[PDB]
Design an enzyme around this catalytic site. Structure first.
Site, PDB file in Angstrom:
ATOM      1  CE1 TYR A   1      -3.019  -3.095   1.307  1.00 14.72           C
ATOM      2  CE2 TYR A   1      -4.166  -1.767  -0.016  1.00 14.72           C
ATOM      3  CZ  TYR A   1      -4.184  -2.875   0.750  1.00 14.72           C
ATOM      4  OH  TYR A   1      -4.971  -3.841   0.482  1.00 14.72           O
TER       5      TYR A   1
ATOM      6  CG  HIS B   1      -3.263   8.148   2.960  1.00 16.36           C
ATOM      7  ND1 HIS B   1      -2.877   8.129   1.543  1.00 16.36           N
ATOM      8  CD2 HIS B   1      -3.372   9.456   3.204  1.00 16.36           C
ATOM      9  CE1 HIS B   1      -2.857   9.207   1.226  1.00 16.36           C
ATOM     10  NE2 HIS B   1      -2.971  10.068   2.086  1.00 16.36           N
ATOM     11  CG  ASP B   2      -3.376   3.816  -0.611  1.00 17.99           C
ATOM     12  OD1 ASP B   2      -2.673   4.903  -0.595  1.00 17.99           O
ATOM     13  OD2 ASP B   2      -2.376   2.750  -0.966  1.00 17.99           O
TER      14      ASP B   2
ATOM     15  CE1 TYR C   1       3.120  -1.668  -5.223  1.00 14.31           C
ATOM     16  CE2 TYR C   1       3.120  -0.760  -3.061  1.00 14.31           C
ATOM     17  CZ  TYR C   1       3.285  -1.784  -3.849  1.00 14.31           C
ATOM     18  OH  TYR C   1       3.364  -3.257  -3.427  1.00 14.31           O
TER      19      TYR C   1
ATOM     20  N   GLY D   1       3.207   4.074  -1.066  1.00 13.46           N
ATOM     21  CA  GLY D   1       3.923   4.479  -2.460  1.00 13.46           C
ATOM     22  C   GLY D   1       2.901   5.210  -3.291  1.00 13.46           C
TER      23      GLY D   1
HETATM   24 CA   LIG Z   1      -0.235   3.764  -2.113  1.00 14.94          CA
END
Ligand SMILES: [Ca+2]
Length: 108
Positions: free
Chosen positions: A23, A47-48, A28, A25
């Site tokens: 997760y 967060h993503d 990404y 990045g």
């Molecule tokens: Ca990410």
């Protein structure tokens, strides 16, 4: 399909190229249902999805500040084959999010 099912540890100290866990990045992310690789990775997963469910706003203050709170509390074991220093990488991530938080206040 365009997603990760493997715990990566790449460009640990280079924020634009960093890939950590499934997760952590830039652009990404782990595939649907994919378990995060450690505590830091789990912060990045939340967060993503937060950004995803807020009209792709990577400058959303909740998403961003929640990640900062999460990063500062990261501890425990990490995944096997991790080339990155967990604490050093969290710091690298934190700098990026600090910048995003600042960018958001500038724009809003
Ligand atoms: Ca990410």
């Amino acid at each position: 399909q365009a997603c990760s099912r493997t715990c990566e540890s790449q460009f640990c100290t280079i924020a634009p190229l960093l890939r950590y866990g499934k997760y952590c990045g830039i652009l990404y992310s782990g595939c649907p249902g994919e378990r995060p690789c450690d505590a830091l990775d789990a912060c990045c997963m939340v967060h993503d999805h937060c950004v995803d469910t807020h009209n792709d706003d990577y400058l959303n203050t909740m998403c961003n500040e929640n990640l900062l709170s999460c990063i500062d509390r990261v501890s425990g074991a990490t995944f096997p084959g991790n080339k990155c220093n967990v604490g050093q990488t969290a710091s690298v991530i934190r700098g990026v999010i600090e910048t995003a938080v600042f960018a958001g206040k500038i724009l809003h």
